[PDB]
């Protein structure tokens, strides 16, 4: 027996870092009574199989860390130091600041006289790190208090990805999952450094290669990913759309598209209206004065029924496919090569390798994470989705757009609507014009096409069931009035990440929740944001350690004596000190358990937020105040067991249960029973559900998220579905759009890697994405018209991706049109001639708040560095390892020079343009000589710009 593990209780957990969702086994001393003694990988877990990258591998050092917060800390206005205080004091004083600010700023009716019932004087940031049950509860607590400025991590990836993939496929999520990468014949990694940023993903990338696959890395830098690919192709920053535009033309010119797939499952056949045109880099319906488009000009030609007209012959010149062919004729190899900086040879190589997956028995996948996805980032991902629809790689094993999520639960936190524009289940936040529940539900487009499922028509069941979970004693129509509404007249982006920092700097916020985020390092233009936080009356920071956000008031250049911001620092417990679920990139909602009890006096986020809310509710019950109803009637009794936050009970409420005896889909359901699927939710108040996507996750059969069953059929095991390991939304459909993986008979395109198959009156393999017999329904059930969208007339920049230059300063020429920059959209001060970029290394996490406190990770990567080419090193007289000053209009910092051939000068319009690489993992707080955030350098000018900002790099003597 191993002594270290002998006598310790053994529990399972999920990694608290990236969205791969690696299994841990935790060993806890005194049969679970004491501290953690060991943390390592779960050998039975089918994603990581015991493997951990150094972040997961170091989780013992994260949890059992004597630098961690022990109890709440208080900082009085202008105070020079922290004052240790009790929970009772901190939550009580916090509950009073909330009420004071709410009562003083709560507006029942906006200027226009419409009901909004909201506060614009309190903002909240975070968090993708919290459990799914804690994210859901947090969102509802903030909305019951009437907040509309509710944001977190997800914003930076959401704004590009979700609208791109939603427009294309009808959902915004990663189409496939990690294990499925192993089934791919060609893996295109472009806008991703997966080897460093999703390391366990490369288990499955390399296994794809073992079974014959070509691995292609498209990156301005040579990384640890590049080292383990068959093809490294350098690309100039922001030349992605040219590159993908060339691939579209290559596929159409060489007839490499999957014809039958395209004719049946994409909108290739649909007739676009006569009002559509493109000329000189502008689509039809352009308002030159306002710099935006009239998208009605891009409408389809509708038949008598109101269904878009189709030519299955694909002969009509206004067929999507024919307009697509016309549009991308301009992206010839010579033009694309010149702008990308990629040799015609390599382009032809990459194009040939990947477009070979257009074969029905071949599958290609594209992996992107953040990359550089600016003005036309949405259109970049649109082009990836369009390539995949052309080659019929959507819905199949080894296919899909694998949009890699960042944080462990950024998928879950987004699903729980911790963004300003969405409630849970991606039901929009009502605007001022949505005066009643009937009007809110009126906005859902209908289809007269009988083959079109148009699943979003069920939205009224989900909204009603949602309001019955929050306010179960009220009519949904009545409860609808409790939750705040945004201004219909204002830009949606005015409620988002970047404008919350703008408003803060204009002192328009009394309060901020920094809940599981480090804005003082995370936010672009750190100098501005750190000064802007001084203009807050109170700040609530909930994190594991003291950090640059909590302690901004004693930061570099700051004078505590003249900063009046009142800070409460509440220390939360680590991931292994609590029970709950995290939803990975693949939508796997994975249950994890408590190992050690919370360290010192730390609490789970659920207990902090629930206790904080109860004290707010108490004050309103005794004092009264502004519109108490939403706060008073919110059902928090379902969240609680044994006087504590219950992950189990919140998860059951999120799945949902019947509030009475109900007949649904011609099947009798008893009162109190768990809802077994979102198909059996109702609009009439019979059912409740916190999130319709969770309906199926916690049934009468039990907690399916806690399943650790590796049982697989041969056809399931061949592609690694593992459908009995945990649970993925929707209803355990592991590969989305899987109806596209079979013909109108129900026979797979690729029988050797079948996802579903029609055998003896049933779909066999994965859960079918949309009920119905073969060839009776269009495969994209969340789309209105039911088709994969090559033509996307809902995008602001036009229905086809078009190259507009995102890299302003060093580029004057667009070889594809007259239109240089985005027509619906930087100083370029010559003192800063270099392109600054920020990116990650394997060993550090986000702002480094967590990993800078883990000695083994600091050991590997102790200091901020500046990676530069040999060419820039020669120009500026810099030697490998020299200290340099990197500067911009926004600030300056010192870092160690790493001179490397992994960085090469960009060739732009006959000039060498040098790119400067910085990690954003560092902050003044810790460690000694670690350095400060690279966001000192980044500009503000609703997503920040972190991949291309102008810098100078000087040697320091």
């Amino acid at each position: 027996e191993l002594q270290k593990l002998q006598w310790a209780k053994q529990t399972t957990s999920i990694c608290c870092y990236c969205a791969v969702g690696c299994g841990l086994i935790v060993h806890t001393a005194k049969d679970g009574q004491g501290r953690a003694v060991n943390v390592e990988g779960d050998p039975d877990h089918p994603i990581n199989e015991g493997s951990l990258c150094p972040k997961g591998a170091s989780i013992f050092q994260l949890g059992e860390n004597d630098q961690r917060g022990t109890q709440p800390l208080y900082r009085a206005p202008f105070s020079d130091t922290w004052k240790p205080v009790t929970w009772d004091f901190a939550l009580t004083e916090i509950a009073k600041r909330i009420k004071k600010t709410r009562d003083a700023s709560f507006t029942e009716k906006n200027a226009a006289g419409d009901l909004v019932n909201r506060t614009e004087a309190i903002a909240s940031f975070g968090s993708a790190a919290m459990d799914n049950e804690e994210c859901w509860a947090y969102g509802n607590i903030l909305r019951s208090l009437g907040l509309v400025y509710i944001e977190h991590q997800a914003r930076i990836x959401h704004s590009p990805t979700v609208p791109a993939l939603a427009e294309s496929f009808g959902r915004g999520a990663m189409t496939n999952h990690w294990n499925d990468l192993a089934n791919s014949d060609c893996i295109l990694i472009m806008g991703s450094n997966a080897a460093e940023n999703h390391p366990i993903a490369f288990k499955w990338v390399l296994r794809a290669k073992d079974k014959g696959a070509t691995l292609i890395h498209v990156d301005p830098r040579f990384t640890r990913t590049s080292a383990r690919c068959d093809v490294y192709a350098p690309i100039r920053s922001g030349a992605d759309i040219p590159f993908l535009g060339g691939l579209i033309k290559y596929i159409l010119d060489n007839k490499l598209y999957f014809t039958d797939y395209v004719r049946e499952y994409t909108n290739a056949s649909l007739i676009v209206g006569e009002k559509f045109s493109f000329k000189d880099g502008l689509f039809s319906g352009y308002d030159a004065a306002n710099k935006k488009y009239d998208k009605s000009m891009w409408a389809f030609e509708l038949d008598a029924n109101g269904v878009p007209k189709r030519d299955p012959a694909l002969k009509h010149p206004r067929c999507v496919i024919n307009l697509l062919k016309k549009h991308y004729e301009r992206y010839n190899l010579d033009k694309v090569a010149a702008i990308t900086g990629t040799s015609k040879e390599q382009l032809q190589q990459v194009y040939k390798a990947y477009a070979a997956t257009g074969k029905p028995d071949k599958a290609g996948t594209i992996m992107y994470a953040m990359g550089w996805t600016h003005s036309v980032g949405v259109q970049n991902i649109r082009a990836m989705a369009m390539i995949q629809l052309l080659l019929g790689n959507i819905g199949v094993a080894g296919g899909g757009v694998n949009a890699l999520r960042g944080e462990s639960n950024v998928q879950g936190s987004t699903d729980q609507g911790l963004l300003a524009h969405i409630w849970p289940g991606y039901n929009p936040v009502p605007n001022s014009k949505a005066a009643t529940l009937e009007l809110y539900n009126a906005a859902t487009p209908q289809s007269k096409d009988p083959m079109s499922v148009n699943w979003w028509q069920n939205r009224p069941k989900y909204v009603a069931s949602y309001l019955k979970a929050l306010y179960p004693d009220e009519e949904p129509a009545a409860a609808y009035d409790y939750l705040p509404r945004i201004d219909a007249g204002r830009k949606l982006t005015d409620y988002f990440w970047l404008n919350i920092f703008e408003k803060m700097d204009k002192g328009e916020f009394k309060g901020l929740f920094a809940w599981g985020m480090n804005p003082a390092c995370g936010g672009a233009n750190a100098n501005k944001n750190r000064k802007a936080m001084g203009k807050l009356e109170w700040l609530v920071n909930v994190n594991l350690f003291e950090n640059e956000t909590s302690s901004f008031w004693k930061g570099p250049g700051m004078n505590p004596a003249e900063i009046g911001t009142e800070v409460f620092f509440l220390p939360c417990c680590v991931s292994i000190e609590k029970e709950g679920s995290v939803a990975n990139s693949g939508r796997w909602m994975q249950w994890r358990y408590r190992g050690p009890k919370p360290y010192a006096e730390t609490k789970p986020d659920g207990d902090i937020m629930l206790d904080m809310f109860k004290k707010v509710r108490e004050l309103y019950a005794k004092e009264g105040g502004a519109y108490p109803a939403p706060i008073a009637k919110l059902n928090i009794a379902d969240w609680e067991e044994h006087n504590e936050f219950s992950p189990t009970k919140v998860a059951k409420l999120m799945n949902g249960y019947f509030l009475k005896d109900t007949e649904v889909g011609g099947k009798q359901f008893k009162k109190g029973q768990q809802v077994p699927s979102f198909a059996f939710l109702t609009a009439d108040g019979s059912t409740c559900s916190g999130n319709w996507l969770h309906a199926g996750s916690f049934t009468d059969a039990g907690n399916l998220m806690a399943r650790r069953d590796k049982t697989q059929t041969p056809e399931q095991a061949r592609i690694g579905l593992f459908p009995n390991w945990s649970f993925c939304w929707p209803v355990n459909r592991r590969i989305l759009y899987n109806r596209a993986s079979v013909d109108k008979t129900g026979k797979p395109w690729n029988p050797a890697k079948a996802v579903i198959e029609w055998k003896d009156g049933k779909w066999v393999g994965d859960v079918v994405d949309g009920g119905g017999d073969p060839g009776t329904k269009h495969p994209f059930i969340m789309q209105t018209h039911g088709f994969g969208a090559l033509y996307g007339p809902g995008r602001e920049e036009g229905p086809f991706p078009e190259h507009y230059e995102p890299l302003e300063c060093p580029v004057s020429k667009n070889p594809f049109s007259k239109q240089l920059h985005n027509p619906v959209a930087a100083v370029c001060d010559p003192r800063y001639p270099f392109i600054g970029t920020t990116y990650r290394v394997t060993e550090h996490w986000q702002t480094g708040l967590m990993t800078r406190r883990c000695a083994w990770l600091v050991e590997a990567e102790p200091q901020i560095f500046c990676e530069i080419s040999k060419e820039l090193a020669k120009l500026r007289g810099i030697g490998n390892g020299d200290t340099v000053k990197v500067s911009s209009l926004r600030g300056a910092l010192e870092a160690v020079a790493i001179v490397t051939e992994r960085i090469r000068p960009f060739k732009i319009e006959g000039v060498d343009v040098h790119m400067v690489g910085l990690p954003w993992h560092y902050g003044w707080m810790v460690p000694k000589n670690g350095g400060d955030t690279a966001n000192l350098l980044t500009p503000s000018a609703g997503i920040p710009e972190t991949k291309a900002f102008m810098v100078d790099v000087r040697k320091v003597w």
């Binding site: 493997s51 951990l52 490369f202 288990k203 640890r224 083994w856 160690v896 051939e901």
Partner: protein, 214 residues
């Protein structure tokens, strides 16, 4: 006996192995600084039993050959460190007959720490400036005896690290060298008759590290 097969053609330099070694044994972190490399710690020492070495070699056209070497004791079949150590005191360095692990005991304080490092053709052993004891990779003999994989082997996600009986590992190395040669035609196995840590190199082992082979 047991053997490590290390397929460096699969290594992503994630350094999971480096961290996992220190987690299992609860070793401390060295004081490090960046001197123009991701490589840290820069060398093995008393408290670092495994480090990943980074080496960049220029190649024709875009990118580089980025060579990664997670360095550990080779656990030699005929240990030269034992032979040299046994000239001062027999016991300081012993060979486990079950696993084939070369193990430095607490009696390595008594022997000449300098010359027993010199005898090692891989320059593995490291001396404590205090207790004067030798430390290195102990093959996680603790775990191997209990039918578990070594920490560095279990943590590795790429399939670089492989562990098991000498016969089935040499069988794997031969079959893997055959498939790796199709991508890296200059691929070779390091000292596959003399050691129990068999490194597959994509090219000249000397490019990965000076003491990569005997």
């Amino acid at each position: 006996g047991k053997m490590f097969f290390v397929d460096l053609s699969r290594c992503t330099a994630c350094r999971g192995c480096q961290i996992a070694c220190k987690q299992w044994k609860n070793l401390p972190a060295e004081e490090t600084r960046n001197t123009g490399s991701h490589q840290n710690p820069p060398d093995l020492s008393y408290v670092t039993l495994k480090t990943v070495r980074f080496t960049e070699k220029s190649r024709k056209g875009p990118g580089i050959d980025w060579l990664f070497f997670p360095e550990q004791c080779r656990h030699c079949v005929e240990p030269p460190c034992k032979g040299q150590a046994d000239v001062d005191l027999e016991g300081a360095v012993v060979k486990d007959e079950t696993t084939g692990a070369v193990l430095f005991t607490e009696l390595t304080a008594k022997v000449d720490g300098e010359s027993v490092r010199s005898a090692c053709p891989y320059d593995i052993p490291r001396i404590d400036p205090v207790t004067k004891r030798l430390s290195k990779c102990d093959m996680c003999n603790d775990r191997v005896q209990n039918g578990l994989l070594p920490a560095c082997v279990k943590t590795c996600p790429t399939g670089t690290m492989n562990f098991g009986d000498e016969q089935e590992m040499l069988a794997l190395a031969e079959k893997r060298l055959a498939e790796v040669k199709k991508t890296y035609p200059g691929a070779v196995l390091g000292d596959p008759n003399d050691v129990r840590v068999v490194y597959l190199f994509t090219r000249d082992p000397k490019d990965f590290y000076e003491h990569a082979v005997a």
